[PDB]
Design a protein around this ligand. Structure first.
Ligand code: JF8
Ligand code: JF8
Lengths: 204, 216
């Protein structure tokens, strides 16, 4: 049993999403006519920063002391399969999706005084906001919820010959030991080629 | 400055946010076109089968090479960069995103189940460029969420497409100067712009040590 609340200024983007997922429009917690959620940065720089006031009101309504507050950010701790396993047994995730140049840092800092907060990144690339990260996190976590290292080698299915390209003969041989051995080898070879860091080697 | 992206998936509805993400100005200008295709269009049988049991045994199913082969034959050309999300891929990084942002045609092949018969990529690679990539060290149900991430990271680097314009980035602040007992760091209001730059550099250094020491 898990509840996920997602807060965003683009609730439309969350449509592709024992478990309930609710999406909230951040602008619901504004009071001005223009529904402003952003302001220019202190200290200079391009772009806009999301106001802490509006976020504070939203999270006040949605969160409890037992909530795990998830804040996607390119400067976050890495979100990995380990993280997904850890969050898979949580009762309540709230995912705060930023836009513009992100959310005023005091939102997470203040939240951390009364709940657990996790600033995380889903990978070493830049997005325009937290919504795609939210989709990734939700997918990776929900598939691990009860009741729902190395790289994987290549997989094959019928026909055994296609366009003059054959399924590796060992996979047709019914020899479980030889097949397991071949698959372990294919895995380790793919890992050293594509992800040498996983085996403790320098990256290209 | 212009790019066509074709996405092939058994869940075309999943790619709805991307079409929503696209400003009319870039489309009208012919700067960008994202098309999504139902893989089942290329199935051969009345049951519209896209998957079959894996050779050598094991759990799950593998996507059929015959179906994918027909789809890619129709959609791809010699200029195509074929992108195949997979947890076993090379890492997709910002460097990758910058490279791909200058391409004219991306085709993203979204798998499901235990992925796509390897001969599809191997065959495709004999007449176009193929890139098997992973967006991170976690496991998804299929390639669609990865496609969303890749499309966003690439298209935001193409001038005027999405509307937007080393160490980790540091914290950002805006009004009010004091909020729930927390003050914006006074240096940011000091008007000492060299000092502010140095402060930001130190925040970035500390954050990187704490969160991503691998980058150091
Ligand atoms: N997680 C993650 C992210 C993001 C991201 C997250 C939130 C915001 C808010 C404004 N821009 C954002 C980018 N970019 N790249 C990642 N791996
Ligand atoms: N990229 C990427 C992926 C995936 C992914 C991609 C395609 C398929 C097809 C079946 N299962 C998949 C998982 N999982 N985790 C990642 N970083």
């Amino acid at each position: 049993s898990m509840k996920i609340d997602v807060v965003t200024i683009f609730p439309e983007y969350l449509q592709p999403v024992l478990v309930d997922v609710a999406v909230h429009d951040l602008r619901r917690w504004t009071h001005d006519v223009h529904k402003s959620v952003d302001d220019s940065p202190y200290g200079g720089g391009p772009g806009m920063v999301m106001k802490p006031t509006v976020w504070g009101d939203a999270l006040d309504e949605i969160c409890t002391s037992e909530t795990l507050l998830v804040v996607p950010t390119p400067a976050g701790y890495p979100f990995t399969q380990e993280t997904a396993w850890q969050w898979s047994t949580e009762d309540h995730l709230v995912i705060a999706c930023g836009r513009y140049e992100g959310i005023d840092q005091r939102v997470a800092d203040d939240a951390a005084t009364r709940m657990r907060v996790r600033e995380v990144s889903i990978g070493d690339y830049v997005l325009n906001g937290g919504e795609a990260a939210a989709l990734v996190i939700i997918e990776a976590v929900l598939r691990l919820v009860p009741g729902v290292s190395l790289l994987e080698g290549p997989s094959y299915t019928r026909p055994p010959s296609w366009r003059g390209m054959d399924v590796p003969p060992v996979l047709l041989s019914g020899d479980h030991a030889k097949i397991a051995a071949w698959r372990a080898e294919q895995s380790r070879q793919r890992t050293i080629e594509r992800r040498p860091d996983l085996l403790g080697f320098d990256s290209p």
